[PDB]
């Protein structure tokens, strides 16, 4: 048994990660708790399209490198998030459509992956391409309006740019095996594997709440995607109210699936959360451990 989340996960060959915000790297409580507890880092915002390419052709890795360098200095690996997404696009990309947008999407993947070549274990190459609800349709965005092949082209571009990186598709509301959105993602990955589209991993954001609740069939979802020949990862876990029971269920689901690489929670303290009002993380505002922290650590330790 180990006394910290990352070390506990590492005993079964897994990681335990968090999202890191560069502007908070001067906060001593934040940096010391995150340093101690996690062995994997995702940049919360700094590796997104707008942050990394604020003007077309003009990259800015200053804040991204602050996160990457903090991670490596503190003994963590890094998940890159995210190369192609409808949200947080810079204005210049929002205005593009069609073939011009396709070229800009490819150029953006190539430039960011070149900067980090060989240094990023997993990339969320494409994020949030499915619509919510019963349709299983693609989300409407400039990217999707450029053609159904946007996702496959992003993945082929990424495979050529950095053959060492594991290439992930990441989404939310895709954890419950019975949901239409989950099945749409399953059918896409299955099709990609049939047609030779490079995809190595699927990320399950795991933003659980009353409208999108945890279900024990998450373990079935994880198993069934692993059986397609991809790794699986829990990428942005948070749980409304932070119940200990659900936090332990999720942890045990990952521990039960050989190709589940690890778990990232989407922040450190409740006050760091994008959904702080839902008190959905493992640490209190003062940095003390919540009941859910103990439940996770115990589950990791068997
Ligand atoms: O700071 C906020 C981030 O936490 C938020 O991150 C997204 C959560 C949902 N899945 C994708 C993540 O990038 O993005 C908005 C930002 O304001």
Coordinates of N, CA and C in Angstrom, one line a residue, residues 5 244 247-248 251 282-283 288-302:
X5 N -2.0 9.0 -4.3 CA -2.8 8.4 -5.3 C -2.0 7.9 -6.5
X244 N -18.2 9.3 -1.9 CA -17.2 8.3 -1.8 C -17.6 7.0 -2.5
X247 N -17.0 7.4 -6.3 CA -15.6 7.5 -6.6 C -14.9 6.1 -6.5
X248 N -15.2 5.3 -5.5 CA -14.7 4.0 -5.4 C -15.1 3.1 -6.5
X251 N -13.1 3.9 -9.7 CA -11.7 3.5 -9.5 C -11.7 1.9 -9.8
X282 N -11.6 15.8 -5.1 CA -11.1 15.0 -4.0 C -10.5 15.7 -2.8
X283 N -10.3 17.0 -3.0 CA -9.7 17.9 -1.9 C -10.6 19.0 -1.6
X288 N -7.3 20.1 2.4 CA -7.5 18.8 3.1 C -8.2 17.7 2.3
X289 N -8.0 16.5 2.6 CA -8.6 15.3 1.9 C -10.1 15.2 2.3
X290 N -10.9 14.9 1.3 CA -12.3 14.6 1.5 C -12.5 13.1 1.6
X291 N -13.7 12.7 2.1 CA -14.0 11.3 2.1 C -13.8 10.5 0.8
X292 N -14.0 11.2 -0.3 CA -13.8 10.5 -1.6 C -12.3 10.2 -1.8
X293 N -11.4 11.1 -1.3 CA -10.0 10.8 -1.5 C -9.7 9.5 -0.8
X294 N -10.1 9.3 0.4 CA -9.8 8.0 1.1 C -10.4 6.8 0.4
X295 N -11.6 7.0 -0.1 CA -12.2 5.9 -0.9 C -11.4 5.5 -2.1
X296 N -10.9 6.5 -2.9 CA -10.1 6.2 -4.1 C -8.8 5.6 -3.7
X297 N -8.1 6.1 -2.7 CA -6.8 5.6 -2.3 C -6.9 4.1 -1.8
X298 N -7.9 3.9 -1.0 CA -8.2 2.5 -0.5 C -8.5 1.5 -1.7
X299 N -9.2 2.0 -2.7 CA -9.5 1.1 -3.9 C -8.2 0.9 -4.6
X300 N -7.4 1.9 -4.9 CA -6.1 1.7 -5.6 C -5.2 0.7 -4.9
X301 N -5.2 0.8 -3.5 CA -4.4 -0.1 -2.7 C -5.0 -1.5 -2.5
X302 N -6.2 -1.8 -3.1 CA -6.8 -3.1 -3.0 C -7.5 -3.4 -1.7

